[PDB]
Amino acid sequence: AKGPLQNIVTWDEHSLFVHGERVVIFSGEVHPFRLPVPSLYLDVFHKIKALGFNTVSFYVDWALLEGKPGRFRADGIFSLEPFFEAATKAGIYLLARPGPYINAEVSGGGFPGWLQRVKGKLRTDAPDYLHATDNYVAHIASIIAKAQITNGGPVILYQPENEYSGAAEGVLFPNKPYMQYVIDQARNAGIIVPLINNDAFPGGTGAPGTGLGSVDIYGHDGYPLGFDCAHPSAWPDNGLPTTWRQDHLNISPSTPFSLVEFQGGAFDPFGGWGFEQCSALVNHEFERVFYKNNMAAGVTIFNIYMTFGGTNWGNLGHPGGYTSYDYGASIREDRRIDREKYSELKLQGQFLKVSPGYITATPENATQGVYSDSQNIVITPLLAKESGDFFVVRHANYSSTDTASYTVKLPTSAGDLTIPQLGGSLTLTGRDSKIHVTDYPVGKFTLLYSTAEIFTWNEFAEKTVLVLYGGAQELHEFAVKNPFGSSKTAKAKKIEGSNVTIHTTSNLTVVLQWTASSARQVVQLGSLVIYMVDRNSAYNYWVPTLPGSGKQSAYGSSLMNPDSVIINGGYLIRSVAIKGNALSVQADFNVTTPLEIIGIPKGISKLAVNGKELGYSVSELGDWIAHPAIEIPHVQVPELTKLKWYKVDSLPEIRSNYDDSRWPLANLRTSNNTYAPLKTPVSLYGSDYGFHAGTLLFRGRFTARTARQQLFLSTQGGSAFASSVWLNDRFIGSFTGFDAASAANSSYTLDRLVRGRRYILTVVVDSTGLDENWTTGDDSMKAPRGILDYALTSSSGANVSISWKLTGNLGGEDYRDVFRGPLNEGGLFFERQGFHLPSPPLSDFTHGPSSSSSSSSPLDGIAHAGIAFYAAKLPLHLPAQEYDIPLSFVFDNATAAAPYRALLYVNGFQYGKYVSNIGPQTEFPVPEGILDYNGDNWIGVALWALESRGAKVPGLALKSKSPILTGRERVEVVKGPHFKKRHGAY
Ligand SMILES: *[C@@H]1O[C@H](CO)[C@@H](O[C@@H]2O[C@H](CO)[C@@H](O[C@@H]3O[C@H](CO[C@H]4O[C@H](CO)[C@@H](O)[C@H](O)[C@@H]4O)[C@@H](O)[C@H](O[C@H]4O[C@H](CO)[C@@H](O)[C@H](O)[C@@H]4O[C@H]4O[C@H](CO)[C@@H](O)[C@H](O)[C@@H]4O[C@H]4O[C@H](CO)[C@@H](O)[C@H](O[C@H]5O[C@H](CO)[C@@H](O)[C@H](O)[C@H]5O)[C@@H]4O)[C@@H]3O)[C@H](O)[C@H]2NC(C)=O)[C@H](O)[C@H]1NC(C)=O
Ligand SMILES: *[C@@H]1O[C@H](CO)[C@@H](O[C@@H]2O[C@H](CO)[C@@H](O[C@@H]3O[C@H](CO[C@H]4O[C@H](CO)[C@@H](O)[C@H](O[C@H]5O[C@H](CO)[C@@H](O)[C@H](O)[C@@H]5O[C@H]5O[C@H](CO)[C@@H](O)[C@H](O)[C@@H]5O)[C@@H]4O)[C@@H](O)[C@H](O[C@H]4O[C@H](CO)[C@@H](O)[C@H](O)[C@@H]4O)[C@@H]3O)[C@H](O)[C@H]2NC(C)=O)[C@H](O)[C@H]1NC(C)=O
Ligand SMILES: *[C@@H]1O[C@H](CO)[C@@H](O[C@@H]2O[C@H](CO)[C@@H](O)[C@H](O)[C@H]2NC(C)=O)[C@H](O)[C@H]1NC(C)=O
Ligand SMILES: OC[C@H]1O[C@@H](SCCc2ccccc2)[C@H](O)[C@@H](O)[C@H]1O
Ligand SMILES: *[C@@H]1O[C@H](CO)[C@@H](O)[C@H](O)[C@H]1NC(C)=O
Ligand SMILES: *[C@@H]1O[C@H](CO)[C@@H](O)[C@H](O)[C@H]1NC(C)=O
């Protein structure tokens, strides 16, 4: 790396520049493959734009796009085109992270399962691995190249590879020829924007200056609390990073300090704590302490992983996680932005985007007892000659939940001042951190200092507006350099509030003190109007940007200090636009509230909200107060237990009339899997035969030699898998699984056999996905699925041979549903047949009354070990044009219930794997777009009873969240193909 290849996106020690403007990049991670509803991407982009972010970072999952080697397919729900179009329409730039390896808690870390057939070490310059990535990178980097800002699109940065940060013992690292080949694939496909990496820690790998394989901007990650959400209140000693400014200067001082992934939640395994408990660990307190600590080090490219997590639908996740990928993120899986951490993150995004002085201030060492007489707080200064200083304050024990009283002594253009200058003390409550400022520009005005935090400011036609906030009951002070100008008359005016005090010095510096509370204080100083609110009130303010013109209209007048309107009230403000003499607002409301609009453009006299005109009151400061009609209706949804359920047996394999003549033979005598050399005479690894997704089945023929024989069977499905065995129709046993078991050794007696007769063992092995490969040189993604080893011995100790057949999804890599992708289906009979698809062939199913002996309902289940599939039509008629109504399917986990596994299908998409004896997921959201809110839907539930007494689903319900009156763009239903009989199925 030797400089920029283009002049649109450039950089220096302090920041990125976009179109010549210095900017703080504040980005949220979103994975387009985890939300297969193209019309919903604009919804998530409006929610992230409203935080004050300007960028989204995204992965691309190779395993979904090249499920058949040599056939790259990114059409329909797999196209990035609607994702790019929504970023341009929202005014968001993108950091593209296509891998090939992405990790991401996805199956294989993004590697397709056919890489288990590649001998060479993954993520090295073994040429079989390198060349296996070429077709994918050539296609995905050319699609990203067309979307670069240099071509009028949203992409501004590209990440090659992922967290290339160490290697197994004895493996070359860093492997600079490998790194360089991955760069060359991107540059050869037309990527000309800067390249950025994401080292796990500040190891220096790939930094500028390291020669072959170096990127343009050195990036690293941070997950300081880890990923285990067992104790969400516990912040352990030494958890806060305190060395990153000096580590940056030691590794890559020529480029901006960049945290390309920083903790926005945590992943959660089977048997984990649930994502509500992750959201309690990475909560609003974590954001204010840890994210302001990154500002203390001068971060200027900062991406929060995850900002919206989505769902691991269609088996796309790895075994170390389950169906949800809510991640505890600021935006929930079902897209709601009610968590307090969302509103706290918005206060920080809105501050940085009006604060260009922060970019060129220089961060210095943290101090204790230097900028305050108190030693109970630590203060990190960011200092500049004239353009303004910033001071990050935290408790000395960063974990402290105590409240401290303090004052500060800060450098200013008027000299060093102990603040408050008018008396009193500041307060830092538990797990809080503040940024205080000196010589902070507010348009034409200047804050000589402020203890209160800045939410936003802007210069409008008739006034300049500044919004300041504090936690409740905190005293704050700020000072404004002479705001009157030449005026002899001019004096402050108190507009609202009865606690604020005003003091003027002889040189006309105005000093204001106030104590934050629910009651806003407002003071006018000439044409400057200051609004002083508490934190909880500031959570409800929004700063939508005014559009510019042309294709890039949504990016506004500039990235920093954009033309804006300030709006107090609402669950979300998505956008504003000027339409003649009207201001038109798009907004969502989850509760009733008024709206106050601050900074009305000149000549505008009409207001609309969500396309409906409304009147307004005018305040003495020229703000509008409007009262939109907000009706939050009671929503009734259908009771699932009352739908007409149909049932089909999904284990016909164990009946004596089953014909397996169409099954693939498991007759490969060698494997290319170098990670797990064969122990058996033939490969029984699914991926060796093209089966990489979901449940596998094996059928083993043998001729009985003695009446009793002993079977040893070693199966592997990934963490929290299970396996079940039958001898002809006789149930032998199950390995019922647990969170810590990815394989199992099982021994069974096969008794009462007729010597000379042929028997068939049917073995079902679930797979919870392919493992990741996060240590280069340890080929962990190659861990196979299926049968690792076996032995069948007679009662005299002779070895008895078994000949095998197997299946996964019908077709393997020639998978049958091109619309829903290569991973959606496993190998269970009902999946193979396509019986999970909309409008299934009801002649092949049975129906009978619930609670009866012939019930076809999953609530009645089955009375033996086995596998059944249940399907029902679910009509919905909900007011989706006006409301966003999140729906989910909830299983009851009754303490007395036999163990089972279940699969949830909605309109042909697999949207849940439920494991009754492992957990933790019971509630499975499914988005509108996959569900049709004004038409028929098909839902499906597979039931796998693991023990001999059978199983049933104890309760299953459709649940709704409180409806949100919405101004989103309309959600279009995803039109997947319906059932058609499959030729060659079995
Ligand atoms: C319906 O209700 C029922 C009844 O309530 C629920 O059933 C209950 O389910 C729970 C959870 O599954 C289950 O408890 C677990 O039991 C298993 C099995 O143990 C038993 O069997 C084994 C095998 O014979 C014996 O050897 C044992 O003695 C025991 O008899 C056990 O492994 C679990 O242990 C974990 O949790 C304990 C804390 O609760 C710990 O003390 C353990 O050390 C262990 O801890 C792991 O998991 C914790 C939770 O995630 C985690 O905090 C901790 O750090 C550690 O994580 C590591 O290991 C786990 C694997 O165990 C792994 O998942 C993690 O991996 C992730 O993280 C890595 C590092 O970042 C990452 O690399 C990786 O990719 C990630 O995936 C990590 O390596 C636990 O005791 C109960 O037995 C069961 N009760 C009954 C009566 O059946 C049921 O769940 C409910 N169903 C629904 C749908 O909700
Ligand atoms: C409609 O959409 C809106 C959003 O637009 C949703 O509103 C959000 O609802 C969520 C869920 O209820 C709210 O989050 C939860 O908030 C509660 C209440 O606490 C908050 O509000 C009170 C004021 O009512 C504040 O006093 C709280 O702040 C104090 O305490 C927190 C510690 O909780 C501390 O960090 C603060 O600094 C502050 O401390 C000061 O006061 C305390 C008390 O006097 C004092 O001891 C201390 O010294 C300081 O002086 C706080 O802002 C909160 O209890 C919950 O937290 C718990 O759960 C989460 C896990 O879920 C954990 O992360 C956390 O650790 C706690 O265990 C939640 O944070 C959210 O605030 C609210 N947002 C807005 C904008 O209103 C609606 O729900 C939606 N409604 C519908 C129908 O859809
Ligand atoms: C830093 O402050 C934290 C937060 O108060 C302290 O953590 C507490 O430690 C006590 C005593 O061991 C526990 O009983 C509390 O439950 C902890 N509280 C929380 C919320 O985790 C911590 O010990 C202090 N660290 C140092 C070095 O002083
Ligand atoms: O959700 C976890 C994420 O971890 C990071 S590596 C982070 C390595 C690290 C771990 C702990 C502290 C610091 C860095 C990956 O790049 C993501 O794809 C995703 O898997
Ligand atoms: C092993 O890899 C080679 C590609 O080098 C291929 O020709 C062969 O069929 C593979 N064999 C198996 C058993 O996957
Ligand atoms: C199964 O047993 C074999 C042979 O003893 C051993 O190599 C292997 O580690 C065992 N696997 C498990 C999951 O216990």
Side-chain angles (χ1 to χ4, degrees), residues 652-682:
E653 291 87 345
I654 63 167
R655 304 178 180 147
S656 62
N657 69 354
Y658 188 76
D659 175 290
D660 69 13
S661 67
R662 293 166 182 90
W663 288 38
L665 303 184
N667 61 356
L668 295 171
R669 293 193 51 107
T670 58
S671 176
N672 287 344
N673 194 311
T674 45
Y675 188 70
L678 295 182
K679 293 179 171 179
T680 50
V682 293

Side-chain angles (χ1 to χ4, degrees), residues 767-908:
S767 172
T768 54
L770 307 183
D771 288 341
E772 291 174 321
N773 211 97
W774 43 257
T775 301
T776 290
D778 173 6
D779 275 345
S780 59
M781 169 271 157
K782 295 188 180 165
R785 303 289 177 250
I787 292 169
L788 303 178
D789 199 7
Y790 65 87
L792 180 61
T793 53
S794 84
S795 56
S796 80
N799 294 121
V800 181
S801 289
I802 303 175
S803 60
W804 295 91
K805 305 191 184 185
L806 86 165
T807 194
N809 73 286
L810 181 67
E813 291 162 8
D814 302 307
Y815 57 95
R816 296 302 183 96
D817 187 350
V818 182
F819 191 95
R820 303 181 182 74
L823 309 182
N824 187 61
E825 292 175 22
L828 291 169
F829 172 79
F830 75 95
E831 297 178 290
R832 301 188 311 250
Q833 297 289 302
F835 291 165
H836 56 111
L837 298 167
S839 306
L842 294 181
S843 62
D844 295 331
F845 285 70
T846 55
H847 175 257
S850 302
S851 47
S852 82
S853 136
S854 64
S855 173
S856 54
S857 173
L859 291 296
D860 294 323
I862 61 176
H864 299 98
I867 309 177
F869 172 67
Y870 295 94
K873 186 181 282 177
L874 170 59
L876 287 176
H877 296 104
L878 294 172
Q881 179 183 263
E882 297 86 16
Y883 292 94
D884 175 0
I885 304 174
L887 296 175
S888 55
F889 293 82
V890 176
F891 286 82
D892 181 345
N893 186 24
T895 266
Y900 67 99
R901 303 171 71 93
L903 294 169
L904 174 71
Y905 275 93
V906 178
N907 293 324

Side-chain angles (χ1 to χ4, degrees), residues 704-782:
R705 288 224 224 126
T706 56
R708 182 166 287 181
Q709 298 188 168
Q710 303 302 147
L711 176 67
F712 164 74
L713 187 70
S714 184
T715 55
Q716 177 161 277
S719 310
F721 88 116
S723 56
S724 297
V725 179
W726 288 259
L727 175 70
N728 289 358
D729 53 0
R730 188 196 301 166
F731 177 62
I732 300 299
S734 288
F735 174 69
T736 55
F738 50 102
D739 63 342
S742 52
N745 283 338
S746 293
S747 292
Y748 297 118
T749 297
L750 307 182
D751 201 18
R752 302 173 294 104
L753 311 174
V754 177
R755 289 190 29 148
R757 190 175 288 191
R758 180 172 287 175
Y759 288 84
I760 302 179
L761 287 160
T762 294
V763 184
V764 185
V765 182
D766 203 28
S767 172
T768 54
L770 307 183
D771 288 341
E772 291 174 321
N773 211 97
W774 43 257
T775 301
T776 290
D778 173 6
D779 275 345
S780 59
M781 169 271 157
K782 295 188 180 165

Side-chain angles (χ1 to χ4, degrees), residues 59 102-105 162-163 198 200 223 227 261 267 305 325 327:
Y59 287 139
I102 58 169
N103 207 59
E105 290 75 58
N162 189 77
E163 185 253 336
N198 70 316
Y223 293 89
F227 305 98
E261 299 174 30
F267 57 70
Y305 184 106
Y325 200 56
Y327 212 82

